[PDB]
Amino acid sequence: ALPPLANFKDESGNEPRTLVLVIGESTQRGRMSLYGYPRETTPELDALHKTDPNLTVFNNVVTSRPYTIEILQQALTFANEKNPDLYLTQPSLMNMMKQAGYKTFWITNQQTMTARNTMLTVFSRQTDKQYYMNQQAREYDTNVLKPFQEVLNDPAPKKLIIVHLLGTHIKYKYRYPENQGKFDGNTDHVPPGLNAEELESYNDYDNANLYNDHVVASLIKDFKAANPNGFLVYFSDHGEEVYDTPPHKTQGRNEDNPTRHMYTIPFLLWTSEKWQATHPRDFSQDVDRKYSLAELIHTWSDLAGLSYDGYDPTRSVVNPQFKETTRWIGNPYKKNALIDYDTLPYGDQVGNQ
Ligand SMILES: [Zn+2]
């Protein structure tokens, strides 16, 4: 029902390309060894970072809201904390890529009620072809690897592939096979004072991070094995507090009682050799920029070579004209409830910038 973006231009040429957006779940920045966590929770992404110069790791990205649909309404559209309802009145990222001539795919391991009018169902139905892998629980994110390959074989020249993961969502223990609890019973690098149940839950979160590392690295590796022209962005919708913040008694997500560990997220960009060769771009000076996921669509637009009325290059984290803005958090529907993420305590801790 919404009109197209005006003065729409694509400067990325007309060669075939495949672009991938991997939406993780409940994965914070501070429990991944890729971001300095002393437990080896992400060995495959670490090794990829050491050996592949085209993996760009962004160190200062946070989400704006710690609830899945509430953040995805901002991340996937032009809505943000100051204007949270723009997802109703302006196009989404998927709409935008359709206007650019891409065939769009939605692969997901999240339980989607296709017969019901949920906001996630609407988003996933905005694409040309959907793969719902979790329609009924022990369903692991490796479920997406087979349809991913299938979509990679799809002959459309320009393709957008969205992969929606369960990531490290509660309950953490169910995100990974029972025989892959690498950190079960381990007390190294654990905060003090946990009881048996809290300790088990903490280690379960690190195990889920290990499996999620395997899944994201597998998506990158399979994509690379297709020798594609394109790139893949991986982000988590939001983080998750798991006894990280002193006094180490809190587990979960609470927007009215925010901690940094609920808001820090991984943010990775893998660029294929063909795309980097054809679209040379240096990101090495962008990796520490303070950025909010709420403006993702501009970054995506920048990476895809798209401009239009409403495009804001200064809010793309890879743009030479990038200008840092306040990273708002807080409920945008309450009266004057927005606060600066930087005001939260414990920002000096590892992975908690
Ligand atoms: Zn937005």
Swiss-Prot record:
Q: How does it sit in the membrane?
A: Multi-pass membrane protein
GO CC annotation: plasma membrane
Q: Which GO terms describe its molecular function?
A: phosphotransferase activity, phosphate group as acceptor
Q: What are the subcellular locations of this protein?
A: Cell inner membrane
What UniProt keywords apply to this chain's record, in alphabetical order?
Answer: Cell inner membrane, Cell membrane, Lipid biosynthesis, Lipid metabolism, Lipopolysaccharide biosynthesis, Membrane, Transferase, Transmembrane, Transmembrane helix
Q: Which GO terms describe its biological process?
A: lipopolysaccharide core region biosynthetic process
Q: What is this protein called?
A: Phosphoethanolamine transferase EptC
Q: Which organism is it from?
A: Escherichia coli (strain K12)
Gene name, per UniProt, is eptC
Question: Which portion of the complete protein is shown here?
Answer: 221 to 577 of 577
